[PDB]
Amino acid sequence: GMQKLTILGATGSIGASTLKVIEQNPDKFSVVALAADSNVEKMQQLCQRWQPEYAVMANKEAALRLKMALAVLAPNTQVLGGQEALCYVATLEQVDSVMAAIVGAAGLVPTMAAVKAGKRILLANKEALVMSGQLFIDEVEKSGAQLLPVDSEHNAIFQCLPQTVQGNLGRCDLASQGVSHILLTGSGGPFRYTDVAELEAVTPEQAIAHPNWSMGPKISVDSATMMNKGLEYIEAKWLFNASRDQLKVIIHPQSVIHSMVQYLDGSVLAQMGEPDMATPIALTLSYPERVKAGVKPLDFTQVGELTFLQPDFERYPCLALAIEACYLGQHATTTLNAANEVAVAAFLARQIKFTDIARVNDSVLNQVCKQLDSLESLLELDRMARTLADEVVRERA
Amino acid sequence: GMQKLTILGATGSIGASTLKVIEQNPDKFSVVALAADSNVEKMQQLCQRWQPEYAVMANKEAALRLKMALAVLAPNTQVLGGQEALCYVATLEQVDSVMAAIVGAAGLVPTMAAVKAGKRILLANKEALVMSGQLFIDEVEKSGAQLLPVDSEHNAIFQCLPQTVQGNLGRCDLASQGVSHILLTGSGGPFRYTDVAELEAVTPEQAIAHGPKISVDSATMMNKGLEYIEAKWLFNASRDQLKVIIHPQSVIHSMVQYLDGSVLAQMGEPDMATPIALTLSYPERVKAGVKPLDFTQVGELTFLQPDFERYPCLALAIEACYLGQHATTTLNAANEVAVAAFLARQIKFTDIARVNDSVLNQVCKQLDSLESLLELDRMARTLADEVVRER
Ligand SMILES: [Mn+2]
Ligand SMILES: [Mn+2]
Numbered sequence: 001g002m003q004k005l006t007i008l009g010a011t012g013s014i015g016a017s018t019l020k021v022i023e024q025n026p027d028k029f030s031v032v033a034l035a036a037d038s039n040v041e042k043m044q045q046l047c048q049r050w051q052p053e054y055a056v057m058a059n060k061e062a063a064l065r066l067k068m069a070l071a072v073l074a075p076n077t078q079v080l081g082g083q084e085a086l087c088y089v090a091t092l093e094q095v096d097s098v099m100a101a102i103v104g105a106a107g108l109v110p111t112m113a114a115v116k117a118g119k120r121i122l123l124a125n126k127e128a129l130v131m132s133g134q135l136f137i138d139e140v141e142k143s144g145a146q147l148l149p150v151d152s153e154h155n156a157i158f159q160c161l162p163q164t165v166q167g168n169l170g171r172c173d174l175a176s177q178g179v180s181h182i183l184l185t186g187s188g189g190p191f192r193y194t195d196v197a198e199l200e201a202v203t204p205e206q207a208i209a210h211p212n213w214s215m216g217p218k219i220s221v222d223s224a225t226m227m228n229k230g231l232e233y234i235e236a237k238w239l240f241n242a243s244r245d246q247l248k249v250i251i252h253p254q255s256v257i258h259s260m261v262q263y264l265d266g267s268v269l270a271q272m273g274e275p276d277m278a279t280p281i282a283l284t285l286s287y288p289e290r291v292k293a294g295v296k297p298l299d300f301t302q303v304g305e306l307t308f309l310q311p312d313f314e315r316y317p318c319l320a321l322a323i324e325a326c327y328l329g330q331h332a333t334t335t336l337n338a339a340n341e342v343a344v345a346a347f348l349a350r351q352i353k354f355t356d357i358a359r360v361n362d363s364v365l366n367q368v369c370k371q372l373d374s375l376e377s378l379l380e381l382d383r384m385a386r387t388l389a390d391e392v393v394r395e396r397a
Numbered sequence: 398g399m400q401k402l403t404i405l406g407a408t409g410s411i412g413a414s415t416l417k418v419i420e421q422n423p424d425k426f427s428v429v430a431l432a433a434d435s436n437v438e439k440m441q442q443l444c445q446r447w448q449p450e451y452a453v454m455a456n457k458e459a460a461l462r463l464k465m466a467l468a469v470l471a472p473n474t475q476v477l478g479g480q481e482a483l484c485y486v487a488t489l490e491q492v493d494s495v496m497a498a499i500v501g502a503a504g505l506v507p508t509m510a511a512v513k514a515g516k517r518i519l520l521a522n523k524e525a526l527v528m529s530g531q532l533f534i535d536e537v538e539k540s541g542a543q544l545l546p547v548d549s550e551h552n553a554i555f556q557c558l559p560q561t562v563q564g565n566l567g568r569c570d571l572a573s574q575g576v577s578h579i580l581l582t583g584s585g586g587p588f589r590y591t592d593v594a595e596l597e598a599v600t601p602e603q604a605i606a607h608g609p610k611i612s613v614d615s616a617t618m619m620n621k622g623l624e625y626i627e628a629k630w631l632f633n634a635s636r637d638q639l640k641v642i643i644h645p646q647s648v649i650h651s652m653v654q655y656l657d658g659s660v661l662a663q664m665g666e667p668d669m670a671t672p673i674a675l676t677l678s679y680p681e682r683v684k685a686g687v688k689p690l691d692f693t694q695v696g697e698l699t700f701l702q703p704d705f706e707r708y709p710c711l712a713l714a715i716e717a718c719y720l721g722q723h724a725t726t727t728l729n730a731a732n733e734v735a736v737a738a739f740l741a742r743q744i745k746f747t748d749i750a751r752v753n754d755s756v757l758n759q760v761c762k763q764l765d766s767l768e769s770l771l772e773l774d775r776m777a778r779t780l781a782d783e784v785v786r787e788r
Binding site: 159160162163177178179180181183250260262263264265266267268269270271272273274276278279280282283286288289290291292293295296297298300301303304305306307308310 | 418556557559560574575577578580642652654655656657658659660661662663664665666668670671672674675678680681682683684685687688689690692693695696697698699700701702
């Protein structure tokens with residue numbers, strides 16, 4: 001029957017992709033609420049097109065402007081403001097699924113609320129599992145909330161897993177279902193074939209070069225150091241309940257293959273596709289069925305060659321940090337992520353060298369570790385971590 | 398749940414890959430019977446190692462020899478002979494699954510026998526579906542026999558498909574489960590990069606490497622065509638739902654394209670124990686004595702759209718596939734003769750497809766049984782014989 005959605009983070013690209021899939025399947029999906037930050041012009045335009053029952057701006061001043069705009073453009077849309085209103089729409093009774101696409105720490109409480117309300121969670125916020133995986137998984141289990149991952153790699157893994165696993169994320173017994181290991185793939189970044197010696201000198205211009213499809217600058221830098229892959233690793237561990245034996249990382253420079261799973265009998269399954277987030281989003285909407293997504297089928301005439309490389313730690317120390325942190329737990333993953341935000345900004349600011357990103361991470365990470373859990377405890381931790389990082393940036397400058 | 402097996406075709410490489418999986422899982426599988434043609438030496442060695450309750454040779458003389466041998470090497474084993482004995486072991490009450498790996502037309506009746514008995518069928522005989530797909534699928538439905546495909550490409554496709562489809566082979570509604578395309582892959586054979594003009598001059602020597610007849614079918618991609626035909630029956634696929642991609646490295650074994658843009662592909666080390674293992678273990682998984690895939694060694698993976706001027710046999714097969722059983726039966730019959738002919742040096746490499754095409758045409762210009770279809774096979778071979786001496 002008809003599926004009711006709330007979309008947290010409707011004015012970004014994840015939101016646009018989600019709405020594209022919805023547009024392609026009018027009978028199947030129905031938008032009950034849309035939520036965003038402070039982009040009123042974009043929101044009003046989306047509310048005119050979609051006429052949702054609710055629209056929310058996190059920013060209360062922005063909510064007032066939208067409210068006035070919509071009084072005629074969308075007279076049946078109730079407009080609300082602030083963090084509490086985000087939780088409100090994420091927990092409505094009639095809502096079946098929630099696209100959790102508000103990014104950063106801002107996204108935690110609203111995402112958690114949907115979780116506690118036992119909703120399907122189309123998880124597109126990194127922080128929930130990077131900062132607070134244990135907490136999220138525990139809550140999911142209490143409420144019966146389904147978790148459907150939107151990140152391209154996690155979604156691909158999910159599709160390469162058998163069904164019994166797919167339905168027991170967070171708690172899955174991989175070995176008992178024949179899964180030897182999960183192979184998390186990534187491109188290796190712009191320095192994938194660059195001599196390690198040369199990394200000291202790298203400019204943000206150089207680190208930023210990417211596929212025609214863009215990324216934000218921070219993310220582009222995390223892709224250069226493979227910190228991005230490390231963060232995906234941490235999330236993967238929680239989504240798929242992966243021991244130190246069960247999760248690996250392979251470099252695949254073309255990114256046609258989006259990740260893979262190695263089974264006990266030697267069989268490997270891999271997911272591939274055109275680089276459009278509507279594919280993975282579509283499955284998070286449709287699971288266990290499939291729907292049109294407005295993505296073209298992959299053309300093997302035009303794919304080019306697919307290859308694989310072995311990462312090494314001299315080239316990608318961040319990845320080692322992340323993996324190490326991953327098995328130390330929430331305090332370490334929280335700490336690493338906080339520190340890395342600062343070091344990347346620092347590098348972009350031309351204050352530090354490219355290779356200084358990992359040093360900062362490492363130092364901060366060490367100190368905190370030498371010394372129950374909540375979203376707030378973790379946010380505080382995040383602040384401490386950022387301060388330590390600031391200090392350290394002063395030194396390496 | 399100890400699983401009891403009968404292996405039809407135990408002395409070839411499918412038999413050896415099956416037995417390697419069984420060796421790895423002594424707690425779960427059990428060999429009740431082994432059957433083969435006329436390779437006594439290899440049989441007696443396998444019955445010494447496995448001490449099966451029964452052993453069968455299709456050839457009755459071969460059976461007598463084995464019976465003398467096993468009086469010393471497997472005194473407990475009961476040795477039987479002939480086509481009826483093959484059906485007998487394929488239908489035993491205690492047997493859960495039958496590896497159907499006797500090749501050629503010889504394999505039809507015993508494979509059919511297991512089907513009528515409602516057994517799990519680990520299908521490794523091409524002829525059942527190439528010659529008489531509809532019949533098989535119909536019989537499978539009546540008895541509740543499970544069909545599990547062994548061929549590397551079919552097994553990969555199976556893995557790529559969703560579970561509800563997996564459990565409804567022969568009669569699956571692909572489009573209603575989100576499947577747009579099944580992508581049947583193959584290496585393209587030794588002449589994938591060879592200029593078409595040069596095919597006229599090709600020597601059997603050049604058409605051989607790594608089975609002589611089969612090696613030649615790989616060269617012309619008639620082997621792929623036959624796989625295509627089987628794929629159509631296994632997965633209930635229209636021509637549009639079923640496409641062929643050339644993948645020279647054969648790391649990917651075949652793929653499935655979904656509605657939302659997603660593709661699933663199965664890859665692995667080249668060992669038949671992986672697919673066989675799944676046919677044994679489905680829906681669970683077991684060790685197969687195959688290592689995990691080494692991405693250090695895979696090299697580059699690439700892909701090509703096949704050219705039908707390079708591979709006219711493939712077009713014939715594809716055409717033949719949609720025409721029906723009479724056409725598939727005809728084509729396969731003709732191709733045996735043409736290949737033999739080519740090996741004999743009587744015809745050129747490119748003549749293989751001409752023969753096929755002629756025979757096909759004459760028969761086509763014109764209820765079904767295994768026998769009707771075998772007779773057809775005979776007619777087709779004679780027609781093919783005429784067509785040869787004339788070149
Ligand atoms: Mn990614
Ligand atoms: Mn093949």
